[PDB]
Design a binder for this molecule. Structure first.
Ligand SMILES: O=c1[nH]cc(F)c(=O)[nH]1
Lengths: 1040, 208
């Protein structure tokens, strides 16, 4: 009746990528006792029975007492003349020098050991193993790579690594402490106006702490100094007050201050942040949080020599790896012989016929795109044509590359791209063997130039080999000198053109006097965003007035996209404007490291901007974007790498995230080589931090293996059983070793001490994320947080969060440092692996659902709208109450605007959270720029229920009409516009992230959502009203 | 004058010569007295500037919007599922390939050990002649050593076959992706044209 008795005959009720194999090959967690064949110098095989967690000291010391009961005993030296070795799962013969290591921790492939004495008598140097571990592929895997570029990278990048370690031991040990513990400081000293007014005309109250003996007691010297006084001054006032006395004249104090003053430096109580240079205390982040949060700083006087005590000497060592012919001579068009793909996996039934579409490109393309005929279609596909490209060979730009793809009848099968010049500047000539890459999910488009340059290293893939026209000699690219001449010639040649011209658009005819309408159509273009595509008229317009455009530095990004790169005439002149163009702000410069600016002069310039302007603070903000932009660099060795590597080696807090951002993407073979090499270099030069990173790595690996077992074997068991298993395993010593003495990668300032397994637990989600809880082992744990806790989540792709939480952080600092205070809580989050990451826990906050499960009464009738307000009142009572609403009203307002602008997945009772103090903030954002509309809008994802509206207007009825809400509604307008004025950045940030394989960022139209939602094509008054309209129609009343 | 007359300009330029502040704009291979005057003429744009070929029910055209959308989004899952298999297989494959290299290297250490003992043992087979006591137990050890290398090459072989069975299944996955892909584009192209024929009624469409 229901189904018209239609049977579905097929349907039968019978019927997080993974898997990183663990302690032994094919098994996650090696059996608690196990058998291992020890192999001796005398060819004898004992077979020791060994505990999972026994050291090699324990195994050797025993093996040389169980080999005494086997033959040929006197053919073996004293054990100390020996060392273990075996095959690993990465598949190298690893000599086991650290005999304090445990058998589970070795990553053996099969359970066996072999004795030897150590060859390669520089033992020290065969701790490349430390770097190999940190990186998760062995350094010898690079020694075996043929390619000159890779080896030329490895040797030449050490130039940078050297100059970095120079800058560290310059004014040591201070300069060393500076590297290790850089001051955490806002880039502006100016203190925003709403922060000021929490100060009674520029005064904080601080609290210095001290210790005398044994280490036991401490003492609180509570100052009240000027917000804009420095650590030095503050160290004095503390020392004054410690040592005033009735047994001391005033002038006697002054001397006993001077001699003590600079024997001390300012710690922060609870974490390894230190105030180590001339900065107004306001400017240090810890302070500026304490102001905002209604908190009294807790600093500490630490003796410089008790700190310089701790810093070990980096000890940087150099490794064991210690005529042309101008392109412009070449007279012909480009041609390229195709030949034959082999491995082409297609149905001859379903699909008709197949060809090799090709093209030449520079980001966007400099000729008509061509193909070959649809030959030996499907079965054994072989062409042997010569594709003829209608660009003359002198008219190639430095950056240009062939893009190709095998298509069907009609949609693409496989793709691959090659750099037309090698890294030595040399036109590519001869035969090539190019293995293809599959087409991505979203990519319907036939050819794919934004994809990575180079062959796939996966052998078993469509190997489309081909030939390049060869001109009897190595064809290089012109010198700069040679390019300057041709620019000056093309300039003088242009001066004597004649009155009229067929397309006098490219040329002026106004000459040194341009019309006043024209000079302000340029600044009108100048202002427009990156995504507003430019009309040919306008390009030729810009391109003509190009020399006036030096007045308006910021115009450049446009100007470059105006040049035709198919005219070396034009291109050569551009190389000379750009040569010495005015440097620009970093926010505009970063546009010029995206895929659309592939030239090296351009990209050099853009680094020259960062070198000058971009600060270690603002670098650390945008690090993600700059590491992602490495993927668009043509060659391994380049200016951006040399910059980032150096900053990383200068500053150990950047260094830290620089490792993890690269290490994060090491699974992804499009960058496995590149990033590997870079990490190797960083790891060799960063000195002792390597050892700190090696513990963090070690820890994350144990956690990966743990959750892996939980998500495969131990599913279909009760939480109860799983939770036994978890604790049982954390008990074991290889774990207690591995998971206790280390730094949080979410922020390496926090230490992670012993694990309280009381508070460690598996969350309820089906991905089985772990709630881990460590002791803060700081001396002043008390004054920060005695227990540190963070969530490890194997199974989910963090990096969409990682970006949105970054974007939010930026919107906050935009808003707040423009004086207008909307408090966003961009909780910490870090991707460290395939779908592996970390999330900062925020204590004392609950999902609105929890609020309603609490305040729900007795018998399950219906939940109340006020419950939230009533739970929020129970927390906040007095002048307190009014302030808890202000906070709520302010955060709700920011999170309204941010959510809407980004279009992040719809918000509901289970992904909005509220704090005891009454701040509201979103978690678990999903897909960001409206990824779910690929299924069939301009959405409002934060739709303010009654609940919020009530709490917004201190508990009224028909709340939409109060003044309380007029404030709120104004904040939303003031916040929406404030972003809009910075909407260039937000385009550029999203624009730089296309290099990642984030499915929400496939290509520029994805990003184009953010235009309509900021309404950039309009004027501002229109946007306001569009925003009001969009806010009105989701809520059904309120916004005029 | 209302066939050819930014974001959804490009979405209707996707995959196809094609053409379509305060006047008008002409877009694929952007261009700023009358409107229908100038487009019929160019339908070669070289001679203007150095460097235009392709221009009843109501409620059961919208049930076809529900139907082609159930096809498409089932068809998309078919694509989205297989892409994962394709990658997992790729992954799993390579782990095997490494294991083979590791197996291989395991063997080479063991083959050398069966070699290593004979040098040092068949010096002690001849010196003194220990008698049948010493050499029956140096014979026992060597018995294991070889029968172990048997086991390893058994284990490696047994892997190498599986590589092929995976590798076989790998190819088969791409095979079917590449047949599903082209139909997926037309299922998608027609569901855009079907919704274009409907559009105002913007707000009635989300349920289908
Ligand atoms: O302008 C700068 N030059 C050099 C630096 F190290 C720096 O931080 N800023």
């Amino acid at each position: 009746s229901y189904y018209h008795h239609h049977h579905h005959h097929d349907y039968d009720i019978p019927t997080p990528p993974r898997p990183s194999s663990g302690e032994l090959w094919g098994i996650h967690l090696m059996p608690p006792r196990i058998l291992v064949e020890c192999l001796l110098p005398n060819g004898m095989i004992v077979t020791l029975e060994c505990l999972r967690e026994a050291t090699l000291i324990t195994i050797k010391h025993e093996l040389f007492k169980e080999a005494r009961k086997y033959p040929l005993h006197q053919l073996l030296q004293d054990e100390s003349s020996y060392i273990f070795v075996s095959v690993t799962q990465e598949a190298e013969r690893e000599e086991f020098f650290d005999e304090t290591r445990r058998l589970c921790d070795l990553r053996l492939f099969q359970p066996f050991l072999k004795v030897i004495e150590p060859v390669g008598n520089r033992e020290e140097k065969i701790l490349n193993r430390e770097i190999g571990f940190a990186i998760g592929m062995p350094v010898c895997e690079f020694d075996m790579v043929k390619d000159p570029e890779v080896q030329d990278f490895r040797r030449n990048i050490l130039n940078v690594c050297k100059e970095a370690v120079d800058l560290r031991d310059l004014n040591s040990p201070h300069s060393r402490a500076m590297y290790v513990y850089p001051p955490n400081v806002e880039s502006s000293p100016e203190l925003p106006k709403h922060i000021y007014n929490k100060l009674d005309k520029g005064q904080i109250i601080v609290v210095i702490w001290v210790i005398v003996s044994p280490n036991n007691d401490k003492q609180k010297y509570t100052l009240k100094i000027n917000h804009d006084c420095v650590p030095e001054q503050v160290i004095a006032e503390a020392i004054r007050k410690k040592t005033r006395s009735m047994l001391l004249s005033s002038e006697q104090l002054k001397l006993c201050v001077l001699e003590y003053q600079g024997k001390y430096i300012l710690k922060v109580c609870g974490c390894d942040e230190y105030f180590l240079e001339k900065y107004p205390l306001s400017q240090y982040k810890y302070i500026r949080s304490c102001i905002m949060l209604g908190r009294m700083p807790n600093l500490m006087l630490m003796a410089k020599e008790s700190l310089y005590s701790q810093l070990p000497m980096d000890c940087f060592t150099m490794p064991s790896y210690s005529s042309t012919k101008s392109l412009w001579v070449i007279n012909s068009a480009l041609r390229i012989k195709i030949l034959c793909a082999t491995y082409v996996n297609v149905n001859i039934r379903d699909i008709d016929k197949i060809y090799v579409r090709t093209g030449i490109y520079h980001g966007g393309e400099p000729l008509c795109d061509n193909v070959n005929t649809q030959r030996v279609p499907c079965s054994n596909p072989r062409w042997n044509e010569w594709l003829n490209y209608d660009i003359y060979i002198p008219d190639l730009p430095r950056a240009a590359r062939l893009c190709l793809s095998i298509c069907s009848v009609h949609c693409p099968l496989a793709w691959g791209n090659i750099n037309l010049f090698d890294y030595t500047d040399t036109l590519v000539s001869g035969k090539m063997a190019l293995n293809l890459w599959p087409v991505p999910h979203g990519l319907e488009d036939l050819l794919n130039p934004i994809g990575v340059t180079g062959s796939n290293p996966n052998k078993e893939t469509p190997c489309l080999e081909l030939e390049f026209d060869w001109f009897s000699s190595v064809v290089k690219f012109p010198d700069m000198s040679v390019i300057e001449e041709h620019a000056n010639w093309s300039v003088s040649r242009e001066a004597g053109f004649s009155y009229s011209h067929a397309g006098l658009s490219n040329r002026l005819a106004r000459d040194n006097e341009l019309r006043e309408n024209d000079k302000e159509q340029l600044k009108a273009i100048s202002t427009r965003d990156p995504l507003s595509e430019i009309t040919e008229q306008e390009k030729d317009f810009l391109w003509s007035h190009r020399h006036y455009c030096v007045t308006i530095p910021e115009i450049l990004p446009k100007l470059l996209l105006s040049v035709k790169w198919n005219s070396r005439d034009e291109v050569a002149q551009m190389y000379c404007l750009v040569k010495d163009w005015p440097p620009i702000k970093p926010e505009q410069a970063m546009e010029l490291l995206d895929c659309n600016y592939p030239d090296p002069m351009v990209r050099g310039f853009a680094v020259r901007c960062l070198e000058k302007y971009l600060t270690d603070d603002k670098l650390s903000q945008y690090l993600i974007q700059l590491v992602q932009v490495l993927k668009y660099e043509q060659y391994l060795d380049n200016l951006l790498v040399r910059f980032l590597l150096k900053k990383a080696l200068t500053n150990q807090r950047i260094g830290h995230f620089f490792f993890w951002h690269l290490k994060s993407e090491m699974h992804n073979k499009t960058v496995s080589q590149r990033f590997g090499l870079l990490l190797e270099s960083y790891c060799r030069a960063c000195g002792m931090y390597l050892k700190h990173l090696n513990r963090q790595v070690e820890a994350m690996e144990k956690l990966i293996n743990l959750t892996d077992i939980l998500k495969q074997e131990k599913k279909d068991e009760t939480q109860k059983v799983q939770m036994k298993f978890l604790v049982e395993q954390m008990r074991r010593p290889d774990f207690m070793d591995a998971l206790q003495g280390f730094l949080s990668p979410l922020n390496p300032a926090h230490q992670l001490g012993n694990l309280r397994l009381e508070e460690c637990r598996i969350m309820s989600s089906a991905k089985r994320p772990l709630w881990l809880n460590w002791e803060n082992p700081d001396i002043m744990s008390e004054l920060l947080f005695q227990n540190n806790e963070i969530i490890f989540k194997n199974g989910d792709d963090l990096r969409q969060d990682m970006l949105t939480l970054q974007i939010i952080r930026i919107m906050e600092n935009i808003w707040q440092n423009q004086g207008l205070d909307l408090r966003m809580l961009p909780y910490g989050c870090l991707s460290i692996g395939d779908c592996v990451g970390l999330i900062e826990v925020v204590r004392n906050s609950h999902t609105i659902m929890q609020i309603q499960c609490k305040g729900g009464l007795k018998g399950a009738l219906q939940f109340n709208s006020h419950t939230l307000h009533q739970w929020l009142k129970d927390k906040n009572k007095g002048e307190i109450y009014d302030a808890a609403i202000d906070l709520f009203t302010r955060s709700c307002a920011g999170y309204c605007v941010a959510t809407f602008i980004l279009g992040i997945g719809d918000r509901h009772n289970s992904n909005i959270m509220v704090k005891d103090d009454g701040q509201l903030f979103h978690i678990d954002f999903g897909h960001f720029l409206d990824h779910k509309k690929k299924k069939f809008r301009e959405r409002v994802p934060f739709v303010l229920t009654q609940d919020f509206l009530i709490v917004i207007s201190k508990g009224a009825q028909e709340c939409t009409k109060t003044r309380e809400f007029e404030r709120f509604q104004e904040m939303c307008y003031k916040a929406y516009l404030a972003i809009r004025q910075h909407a260039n950045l937000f385009i550029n940030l999203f624009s730089m992230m296309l290099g990642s394989g984030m499915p929400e960022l496939q290509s520029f139209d994805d990003i184009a959502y953010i235009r309509k939602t900021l309404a950039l094509d309009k004027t501002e008054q229109e946007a306001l009203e569009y925003f009001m309209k969009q806010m009105n129609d989701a809520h059904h009343g309120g916004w005029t | 004058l209302q066939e050819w007359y930014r974001e959804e300009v490009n979405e209707k330029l996707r995959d196809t010569g094609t053409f379509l502040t305060k006047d008008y704009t002409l877009t694929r291979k952007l261009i700023k007295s009358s409107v229908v005057e100038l487009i019929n003429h160019y339908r070669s744009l070289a001679q203007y500037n150095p460097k235009l070929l392709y221009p009843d029910n109501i409620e059961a055209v919208g049930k076809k919007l529900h139907e082609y959308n159930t096809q498409f989004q089932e068809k998309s899952r078919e694509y989205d599922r297989l892409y994962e298999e394709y990658t997992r297989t790729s992954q799993e494959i390579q782990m095997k390939r490494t294991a083979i290299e590791a197996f291989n290297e395991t063997i080479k250490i063991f083959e050398e050990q069966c070699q290593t003992q004979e040098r040092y043992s068949k010096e002690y087979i001849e010196k003194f002649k220990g008698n049948e006591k010493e050499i029956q137990r140096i014979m026992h050890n060597y018995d294991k050593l070889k029968s172990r290398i048997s086991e390893i090459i058994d284990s490696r072989r047994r892997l190498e076959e599986d590589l092929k069975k995976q590798a076989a299944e790998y190819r088969e996955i791409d095979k079917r992706m590449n047949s599903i892909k082209p139909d997926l584009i037309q299922l998608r192209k027609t569901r855009d044209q079907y919704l274009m024929w409907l559009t105002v009624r913007q707000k009635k469409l989300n349920e289908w």
